[PDB]
């Protein structure tokens, strides 16, 4: 559809902070397209745009765009969900992130927060098995909701508790990683991670907002992680 577009700012290095220039293009009605195709079509007229896209199938958290106030995967979220009755579709960049480029903003704080949880196995060295590990699939059927966090930063930027204190908290997915490497029976180092997390008020900084689950792009359960890890932690330090 022949459409006007209105975005946050198409060049950050310009002296001014706000820039709501008029995007304009004439699009067709007889063939559906997705938001990235809008980007593709525009990029040859308004040249100074930029964006971080990878896969056109939405599997590697490339473009978790929060447009019009609602977040989603830019390769899952078409335009009709933006051209509702009224005008002024809004596709501004993501929240609370450094203005270092137009839409590929920095995630150093975010990826670092993920890093501080030691998201990797560790074996002191005992070799109970010889050739292959020993695990009953009763674990795997309850592990199917942790190892696909695509790091799209939808839930993390969408946690009310995390906002006010950006550095003291740990975020939902930063806890999904902990829980993954926790109830994966192939480790035995629960206590050190637990009482290292116990110290910081990060686990409890949660007020059980639970909005993130609806907002999640993969339909993952961080609330579940927040539940079992609280239960276990309480059990230890009581």
């Amino acid at each position: 559809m022949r459409l006007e577009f209105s975005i946050y700012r198409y060049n950050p290095d310009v002296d001014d902070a706000p820039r709501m220039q008029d995007y304009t293009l004439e699009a067709d009605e007889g063939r559906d397209m997705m938001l990235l195709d809008a980007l593709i079509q525009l990029k040859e007229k308004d040249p100074s745009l930029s964006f971080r896209r990878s896969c056109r199938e939405g599997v590697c958290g490339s473009d978790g765009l929060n447009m019009n106030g609602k977040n989603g995967l830019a390769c899952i979220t078409p335009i009709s969900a933006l051209n509702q009755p009224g005008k002024k579709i809004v596709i501004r960049p993501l929240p609370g992130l450094p203005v270092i480029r137009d839409l590929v903003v920095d995630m150093g704080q975010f990826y670092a927060q993920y890093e501080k949880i030691k998201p990797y196995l560790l074996n002191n060295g005992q070799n109970p098995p010889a050739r292959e590990h020993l695990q009953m699939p009763e674990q795997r059927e309850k592990l199917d909701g942790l190892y696909e966090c695509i790091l799209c930063a939808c839930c993390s930027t969408s946690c009310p508790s995390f906002w006010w204190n950006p550095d003291k908290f740990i975020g939902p997915a930063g806890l999904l990683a902990a829980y993954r490497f926790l109830i994966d029976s192939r480790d035995t180092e629960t206590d050190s991670r637990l009482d290292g997390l116990s110290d910081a008020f990060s686990v409890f900084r949660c007020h059980s907002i639970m909005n993130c689950v609806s907002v999640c792009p993969k339909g993952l359960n961080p609330t579940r992680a927040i539940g079992h890890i609280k239960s276990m932690l309480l059990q230890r330090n009581a």
Partner: protein, 114 residues
């Protein structure tokens, strides 16, 4: 900046706001108990101060905010006891029922006023 759908935020903020006002409530009620019990000379005085419609509005508000706080507190209690199950429908139904019983307890304060 704007998200337009903070369903949990309103439920949550209403907890710390009510806490912050109840924290000064408890002081107002300590004052009221003090000035009342001292002798008969104050009791009617105290009821006299229990009289004005500004004061009645306040005290009903004190007790309504208190009821909201108590109820949400119980939800935080039971939900973290593990006695309540987690899902979207549970959250929205808890919001509904808690709000209804909050208005119910509010009405109790109104009955006390009348």
């Amino acid at each position: 900046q704007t998200i337009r759908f903070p369903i949990t935020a309103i439920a949550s903020i209403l907890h710390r706001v009510s806490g912050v006002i109840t924290f000064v409530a408890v002081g107002i009620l300590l004052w009221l108990l003090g000035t009342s019990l001292s002798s008969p000379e104050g009791f009617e005085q105290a009821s006299a101060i229990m009289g004005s419609f500004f004061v009645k509005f306040i005290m009903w508000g004190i007790l309504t905010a208190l009821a909201y706080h108590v109820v949400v507190g119980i939800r935080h209690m039971m939900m973290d006891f593990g006695y309540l199950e987690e899902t979207f429908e549970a959250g929205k139904r808890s919001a509904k029922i808690s709000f209804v019983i909050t208005v119910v307890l509010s009405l109790l304060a109104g009955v006390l006023v009348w």
